[PDB]
Every structure is written in C-alpha cells, then in structure tokens.
UniProtKB/Swiss-Prot annotation:
This is Dihydroorotate dehydrogenase (quinone), mitochondrial. Catalyzes the conversion of dihydroorotate to orotate with quinone as electron acceptor. Required for UMP biosynthesis via de novo pathway. The keyword Oxidoreductase applies. Pfam families: DHO_dh (PF01180). Belongs to the dihydroorotate dehydrogenase family. Type 2 subfamily. Pathway: Pyrimidine metabolism; UMP biosynthesis via de novo pathway; orotate from (S)-dihydroorotate (quinone route): step 1/1. Binds 1 FMN per subunit. The gene is DHODH. The keyword Magnesium does not apply. Monomer. The active site is at residue 185. FMN binds at residues 66-70, 90, 151, 182, 225, 253, 276, 305, 326-327. The uncleaved transit peptide is required for mitochondrial targeting and proper membrane integration. It comes from Homo sapiens.
C-alpha cells in the first residue's frame, strides 16, 4: 500500500466528506479531475493487464463507470488517474435538470451511496461539441489502448424511448468506441420495464440499424446495461435477444432498488439506486448468470462494489472481460485505481493466470 492510498483513505477523503454534501463533493471531484489536479499515477500498467475485446485493445481492465462524468468534462483527467477506459453519460437527447436536491446520500457505515439524480444531462448537442474538441486526441488514446464509451439515456418526458436512443446513436455514436443502452436506471419511470421481450427486441433492432448506418471508422460497438433486480425470466429474455440480434456486449450491473438486510446508514430508506459494497455480490452473481446464459460468447463489463483487486478478479472469474467502479472512488479517492490494478496483477500471479484474458470466466471451467 502506497503513502497516498493510506492518506486519501484514512485522512483526506473522510475530512472532505465531513465538510461537503455528496453532490457538492462530486462537482468538485469532476472539476479537479478536468484540471488534472490529481495525484501522480505511480502504477505502470504491465502486459498481464492488457485485454482485447469489443474490437479494441484495453491497456488495463479497470474503467470509470457511467455517472461520474455525465457530460464528458473530465475524460483526459480520468485517463491520467490510470483508468484503462472511460465511460461518459448517461446523456439524454435534450438537456434536463434531473430531480430536486438533495438527490444523493452517503451511507458511510455501509461503504455505499444511494442516488436519485434522475438523468441530469447537458444533452447530446453540448456533449457532441465537447467530444468534437478532442476527437483526434481520443483517436490516438484509443489506438494506444485507452477507449471511450458513451452511455445513452432518454428524456423524462419522451413519447418514444427507442427514438431517444436512436438520436443518441446518430449524434454520439461517431465519437464513441462503444455505446451503452440502459434497460436499467432505477430513477426514470418506464426504462427497466421495456424487458417485455418483443419490446426489447424492437428497441435494440432500431439501435443496431442506426449504428450499422454509420461510416465504418465511426461505427461503435453497442452494449446493453442491466439492473441487478431482474427476474430469472427477464435475464433469460435478455440473453435470448442479445444472441438473436448480435449485441456486442453487456454491462452488469447498474445500481439496485433493493435494500439488502444489514444496511446501517441512517439514510438507507432514501429512494434511489444503491451502489458500493452492499451491491458487490448481487452484481457478481448477475455476471455469473449472464455469462452462462450467453455461453461465454458475449463480452461482459462487470460493475458494482469493486474496491479491491479481489473484487475485480471475482467479477473476471465470474465472466467479466473488463470491470468498472464509481462508488469506491467516492470513498477512497484517486489512489484506489492503482490499488485495484496492483492487487489484481498480484492475485492473477498467485492463482496461476498468465494475464486477465486467461482468468475471464475461469469459475465456469
Ligand atoms: N500535480 C498533482 C496534483 O495537482 N495533485 C493534486 C492532488 C490533490 C488535490 N486536492 N487538493 C485538495 C484540497 F483540499 F487541498 F483542496 C483536494 C484534492 C483532491 C481530493 C480529491 C479528489 C481530487 C481529484 C480528483 C478526485 C476524483 C475522485 C475523488 C476525489 C478526487 C483532488 C489537488 C492536486
Ligand atoms: C451517483 C451515481 C450516478 C450514476 N449515474 C449513472 C448514469 O447516468 N448511467 C448509468 O448507466 N449508470 C449510472 N450509475 C451507476 C454506475 O455506473 C454503476 O453501474 C453502479 O454505481 C455500480 O458501481 P459502483 O458500486 O462501483 O458505484 C450511477 C451511479 C452513481 C453512484
Ligand atoms: O441519473 C441517475 O439517477 C442514475 C442513472 C443510472 O443509470 N443509474 C443510477 O444509479 N442513477
């Protein structure tokens, strides 16, 4: 463990958390990240951590989850922090304010957060112009193994969810290495309930037709991001549609609307999605199920409660090719990224894996 890891985890982040409400702390974290005001990434990525998936090289398998950089303001700072890939968004077609404040709550005793932001978004046109300003810088980053994902949402008052996603594909698809469609924010009325199988097939058919219409250099992979709260029937139906349509991958999982027994935080009964440690094993088990139902042929990005190398390797062994985190960064600060990478490399060696690739889905064998 480094000097920075202990200083951020034991002293700086708890002190800042004592001074700032979580939304103010997030806004300051995005601004500092955007300005490069972040500790030196002392972890040189080894060859063991390189992954080839979704038509791209990934220098390391640890990404920043959607929601940290909703509006594409801090992408370059996030690579500087040591992430192997960045996902921005969710981005909605039109700008929207999201829910009234307060709308995010820390559960420090649980190493958890509850959020109900409600897709606050600068909208597609603002994010398009932001990504255009650094499009060729991003082309070089992607070529050097640091890809960019864009997570697409829908407006609260949309009368045609599939058309909102199609607009996102047309506008930001040409600027993305991969696109994500949520069947899964807990904080918009109707999004998770297009699990109705024929309706999911109709939505994803439209999204894939729009993606296929882009020029080859500008044609991203398309992934579906799912909730951890799906029925067995919902998971069977998603696996079926994903294989039928040739969806490129899955992101498993979003936040949970469940409240696991044992939460201690005073704010545990706030409305919203729960993230961090209490989500971890529900997310790992969802990865394991989706990997089996897709016969290991559909790349999975594993997300929920990753804050250590062990957490990352458990999701990789369950079937994830890549992992993401958000809530750990909230609690432990920037040093957590190097921590996860160092711990994951050590555990791969301890368990006899030549690299990340050899560990993907190892538990199923
Ligand atoms: N050339 C190196 C350099 O300028 N380093 C630097 C390191 C820390 C800070 N910094 N200074 C403060 C304070 F309190 F003194 F003003 C706070 C931090 C800090 C604290 C937490 C985060 C970040 C940056 C991002 C971030 C993202 C996710 C969560 C927490 C934070 C920066 C500023 C600069
Ligand atoms: C404050 C907050 C905002 C989020 N916003 C989004 C979003 O806009 N789109 C999305 O797909 N996921 C969003 N997520 C979910 C994360 O991408 C991730 O799936 C989830 O938080 C689990 O990872 P974690 O336990 O490492 O935070 C958000 C999560 C948090 C905590
Ligand atoms: O904007 C939000 O409220 C949000 C979106 C999402 O997909 N997940 C989440 O936990 N919150």
């Amino acid at each position: 463990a480094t000097g920075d890891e202990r200083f951020y985890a034991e002293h700086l982040m708890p002190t800042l958390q004592g001074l700032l409400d979580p939304e103010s702390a997030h806004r300051l974290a995005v601004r500092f990240t955007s300005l490069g005001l972040l500790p030196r990434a002392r972890f040189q990525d080894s060859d063991m951590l390189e992954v080839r998936v979704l038509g791209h090289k990934f220098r390391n398998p640890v990404g920043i989850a959607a929601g940290f950089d909703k509006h594409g303001e801090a992408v370059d700072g996030l690579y500087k922090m040591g992430f192997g890939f960045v996902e921005i968004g969710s981005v909605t077609p039109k700008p929207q304010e999201g829910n009234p404040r307060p709308r995010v709550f820390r559960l420090p005793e649980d190493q958890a957060v509850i959020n109900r932001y409600g897709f606050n978004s600068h909208g597609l046109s603002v994010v398009e112009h932001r990504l255009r300003a650094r499009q060729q810088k991003q082309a070089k980053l992607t070529e050097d193994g640091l890809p960019l994902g864009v997570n697409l949402g829908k407006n609260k008052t949309s009368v045609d969810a599939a058309e909102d996603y199609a607009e996102g594909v047309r506008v930001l698809g040409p600027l993305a290495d991969y696109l994500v469609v949520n069947v899964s924010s807990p904080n918009t009325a109707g999004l998770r309930s297009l699990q109705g199988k024929a309706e999911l097939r109709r939505l994803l058919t439209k999204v894939l037709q729009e993606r296929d219409g882009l020029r080859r250099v500008h044609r991203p992979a398309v992934l579906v991001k799912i909730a951890p709260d799906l029925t067995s029937q919902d998971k069977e139906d998603i696996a079926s549609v994903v294989k039928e349509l040739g969806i490129d991958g899955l992101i498993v999982t979003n936040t949970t609307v469940s409240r696991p027994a044992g939460l201690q935080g005073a704010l545990r009964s706030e409305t919203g999605g729960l993230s961090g440690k209490p989500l971890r094993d529900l997310s790992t088990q969802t990865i394991r199920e989706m990997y089996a139902l897709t016969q290991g042929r559909v790349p999975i990005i594993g997300v929920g409660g990753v804050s250590s190398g062990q957490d990352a390797l458990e999701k990789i062994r369950a079937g994830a090719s890549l992992v993401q985190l958000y809530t750990a960064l909230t609690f432990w600060g920037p040093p957590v990224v190097g921590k996860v990478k160092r711990e994951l490399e050590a555990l791969l060696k301890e368990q006899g894996f030549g690299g990340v690739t050899d560990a993907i889905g190892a538990d199923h064998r």
